[PDB]
Design a protein around this ligand. Structure first.
Ligand code: K
Ligand code: K
Ligand code: K
Ligand code: K
Ligand code: K
Ligand code: K
Ligand code: K
Ligand code: K
Ligand code: K
Ligand code: MG
Ligand code: MG
Ligand code: MG
Ligand code: MG
Ligand code: MG
Ligand code: MG
Ligand code: MG
Ligand code: MG
Ligand code: MG
Ligand code: MG
Ligand code: MG
Ligand code: MG
Ligand code: MG
Ligand code: MG
Ligand code: MG
Ligand code: MG
Ligand code: MG
Ligand code: MG
Ligand code: MG
Ligand code: MG
Ligand code: MG
Ligand code: MG
Ligand code: MG
Ligand code: MG
Ligand code: MG
Ligand code: MG
Ligand code: MG
Ligand code: MG
Ligand code: MG
Ligand code: MG
Ligand code: MG
Lengths: 55, 94, 95, 45, 122, 94
RNA sequence: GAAAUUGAAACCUGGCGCAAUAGAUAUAGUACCGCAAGGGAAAGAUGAAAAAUUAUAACCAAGCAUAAUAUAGCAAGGACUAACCCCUAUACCUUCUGCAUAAUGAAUUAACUAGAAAUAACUUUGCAAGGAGAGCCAAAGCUAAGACCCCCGAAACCAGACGA
RNA sequence: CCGAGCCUGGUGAUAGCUGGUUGUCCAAGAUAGAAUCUUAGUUCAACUUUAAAUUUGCCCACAGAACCCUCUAAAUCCCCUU
RNA sequence: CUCGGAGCAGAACCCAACCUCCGAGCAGUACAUGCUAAGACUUCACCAGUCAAAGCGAACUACUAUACUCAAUUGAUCCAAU
């Protein structure tokens, strides 16, 4: 359910998850469906991260 | 024919190998402007460069490894000297 | 195995598997050792204890029994005071 | 906001959507294999 | 039964006569090898096929440089009958960054850092 | 009238095979090459103790690249433009 | 392989059916075959007008004819001024450890003649601790779609008829 | 055309057996055994294929792996480095 | 026709022949050969088989006492008896 510039979301996600993983995460951007797919389990980290952002 | 003779002269056994007959450009523009390099020569130039860099990389690793081993031997010798010092002996010898 | 029944057109369950094996919802199958009630007088207590154990099945046997049973036996059950309730889910499993 | 506005105004300059230019999403229609040809014929797997 | 072959260490002990024949200097051993495969790996046991791949000798008559160290030499001793081993010579020393693109490996085992494709004026 | 029983090159009775002059020379030529290989394997540049660990850093980094490429597999990105460009199949002149 | 229980829709005149080896066997259960029960075909093609019949041109399989043949060889290839002469080359399918094999099938042409589907899993959408247009599944699941499973052949067995 | 008629039906009987199995192109690909009225077949391993996860795999330095016994075998296992 | 030892198969494992040899289908002593539980082995799959620290409960301060001696010394499911 991502609207607008999904590529902006990917850079923010990569910046946020880089310290935790120690490397750039492997992500897939689906412009058609507005879906960002990330390798690994980061649901709890991203839910709090998106909640802080105001979403 | 003549492969062994070419080796004795320091040349490639196959005349199509390294040399002016192969590596030089086959043609140039009539006004004198040089032609673009042949695709075969570009492949050989890149392949030779990788071989040259591999020679340097192997040489530097062995040089670095020899220094590291020599550094360890020097360090091992120094450690023996320090342990010699201790408290002055006493008893019968005093 | 009956892949398409003659009256309903549905896959049937081999009831021999049900009477012998228990499928944990995690995908594992639990069975009893063969001959654990046979000739106990000639078997050492160390051997007899191993026969009384409830062991798991390997990937091939577990996959075989999945094909021989319908989706009814793979559903999640909430039996009251189920002895095997704690074994229906995996913990700290990697890969 | 390059996801919503950009995906629509780009559609303005494209030909009208009709029944003659509809395709399934890639990867959603796996090709059908038939026992024809040298590869999948003969003993047919 | 056909098994792997244990080569005695006496085979790899150079006599003074050998040094004069091949010109090598035991006190200054060559740093690098020039290994070229001149024999096919077919009709040879699989362990010889694997070692050829490890040494990067898949294509015959393609020179490959390897370090003259006991571990590398151990692999060479297994497939010594399939390869030609020559010492790498550096008449002008190791190539530098300036002359990396002007190097050539001659048939004599010498790596020349300058390659002008011109006859000598001498 | 002179026939080999069974197949020629297999069995208890075989067709005799003889070594020609050039057959010997070819074997001797390859024997000389291997003899020179024995000489060049008799002079290692470093001992086993000196060699140890001199290339561990590069070998470890080489395998980390293999691990990185192995764990980087993922479906490629999907773009709206690629899906929308399929409408051009019915583009016509006005 | 149930049952209790549950409980919906229902406007004939349509076709991502066949088009003369197809679609019924069918132009017909006729011709023909059998004592009988029974088995069971093949095919037609002008045009607005035949009360326009010197009409409706032509080109297309195998088979021939126009037009037999010239050293030598899986009949071809490389070629060549030149068809051949020169050089190179042990048909195909099946079956096998292995087939030019003197193992199998095939005169040839046209038409017909042989991969059907669950269980999960994967891939791509939807929605999401929910999914699904009552049922079912669910400790990221669930719903929907795509995608995998041939042809011919016995000697027999049984039931009911028809035959001295 | 009788070691037991013929016709129809069950019937598209069944066949671990034989034969056949239709467009183009590319890629990976030859594999210890065990059980079986089983060795003309199957199932499980092994091998092979695809997708996926993440981490060592192969080649191998010392050190190390038995007495009894006639061949005091070629070698193997283990194994950092590379 | 199943099981075990030895040679073939000399040194980790494995390895066939209607190959060369010898055996097994028990016996004896206990009556904690009670219970339970880390980590392992495994007859090339599976089934089956094998070894086990700690702990509970015993034994025990004499008892090479703590999963008997022994090489094989054996038979799945269904079913039947209780
Ligand atoms: K095929
Ligand atoms: K193939
Ligand atoms: K012979
Ligand atoms: K055939
Ligand atoms: K046959
Ligand atoms: K023959
Ligand atoms: K034959
Ligand atoms: K025949
Ligand atoms: K069979
Ligand atoms: Mg064919
Ligand atoms: Mg003969
Ligand atoms: Mg008809
Ligand atoms: Mg009619
Ligand atoms: Mg014709
Ligand atoms: Mg000829
Ligand atoms: Mg010929
Ligand atoms: Mg045969
Ligand atoms: Mg042949
Ligand atoms: Mg003939
Ligand atoms: Mg034939
Ligand atoms: Mg035959
Ligand atoms: Mg015919
Ligand atoms: Mg199917
Ligand atoms: Mg399917
Ligand atoms: Mg037939
Ligand atoms: Mg009967
Ligand atoms: Mg009857
Ligand atoms: Mg009469
Ligand atoms: Mg009769
Ligand atoms: Mg059949
Ligand atoms: Mg049969
Ligand atoms: Mg291939
Ligand atoms: Mg039996
Ligand atoms: Mg078999
Ligand atoms: Mg190994
Ligand atoms: Mg290692
Ligand atoms: Mg032995
Ligand atoms: Mg082995
Ligand atoms: Mg095992
Ligand atoms: Mg204890």
């Amino acid at each position: 359910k991502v609207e607008g510039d999904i590529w902006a979301l990917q850079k923010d996600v990569e910046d946020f998850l880089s310290p935790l993983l120690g490397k750039t995460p492997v992500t897939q951007v689906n412009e058609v469906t507005g879906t960002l797919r990330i390798k690994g389990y980061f649901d709890q980290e991203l839910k709090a991260w998106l909640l802080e952002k105001g979403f | 024919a003549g492969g062994q003779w070419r080796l004795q002269q320091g040349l490639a056994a196959n005349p199509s190998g390294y040399g002016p007959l192969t590596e030089l450009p086959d043609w140039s523009y009539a006004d004198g402007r040089p032609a673009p390099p042949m695709k075969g020569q570009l492949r050989r130039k890149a392949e030779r460069e990788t071989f040259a860099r591999r020679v340097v990389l192997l040489s530097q690793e062995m040089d670095a490894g020899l220094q590291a081993w020599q550094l360890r031997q020097q360090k091992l010798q120094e450690e023996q000297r320090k342990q010699e010092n201790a408290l002055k002996p006493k008893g019968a010898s005093l | 195995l009956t892949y398409f029944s003659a009256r309903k057109g549905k896959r049937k369950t081999v009831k021999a598997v049900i009477d012998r094996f228990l499928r944990l919802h995690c995908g594992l199958w639990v069975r009893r050792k063969a001959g654990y009630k046979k000739k106990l007088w000639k078997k050492t207590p160390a051997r007899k204890k191993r026969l009384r154990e409830f062991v798991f099945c390997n990937k091939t046997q577990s996959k075989l029994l999945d094909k021989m049973t319908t989706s009814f036996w793979k559903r999640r059950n909430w039996y009251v005071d189920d002895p095997y309730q704690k074994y229906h889910d995996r913990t700290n499993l990697k890969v | 906001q390059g996801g919503g506005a950009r995906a629509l105004d780009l559609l303005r300059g494209l030909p009208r959507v009709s029944l003659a230019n509809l395709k399934p999403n890639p990867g959603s229609k796996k090709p059908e294999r038939r026992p024809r040809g040298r590869r999948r014929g003969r003993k047919c797997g | 039964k056909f098994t792997r072959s244990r080569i005695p260490e006496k085979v790899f002990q150079a006599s003074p006569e050998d040094h004069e024949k091949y010109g090598g200097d035991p006190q200054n051993p060559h740093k690098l090898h020039i290994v070229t495969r001149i024999k096919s790996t077919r009709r040879r046991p699989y362990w010889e096929k694997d070692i050829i791949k490890m040494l990067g000798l898949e294509k015959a008559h393609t020179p490959q440089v390897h370090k003259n160290i006991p571990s590398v030499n151990a692999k060479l001793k297994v497939v010594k009958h399939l390869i030609r081993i020559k010492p790498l010579k550096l008449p002008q020393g190791l190539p530098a960054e300036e002359n990396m693109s002007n190097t050539c490996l001659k048939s004599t085992g010498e790596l020349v850092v300058q390659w002008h494709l011109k006859p000598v004026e001498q | 009238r002179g026939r080999i029983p069974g197949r020629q090159w297999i069995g208890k009775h075989r067709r005799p095979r003889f070594v020609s002059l050039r057959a010997k020379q070819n074997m001797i030529r390859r024997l000389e090459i291997e003899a020179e290989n024995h000489y060049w394997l008799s002079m290692p540049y470093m001992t086993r103790e000196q060699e140890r660990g001199h290339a561990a850093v590069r070998r470890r980094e080489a395998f980390e690249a293999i691990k990185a490429a192995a764990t980087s597999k993922f479906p490629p990105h999907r773009f709206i433009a690629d899906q929308l460009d399929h409408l051009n199949v019915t583009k016509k002149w006005s």
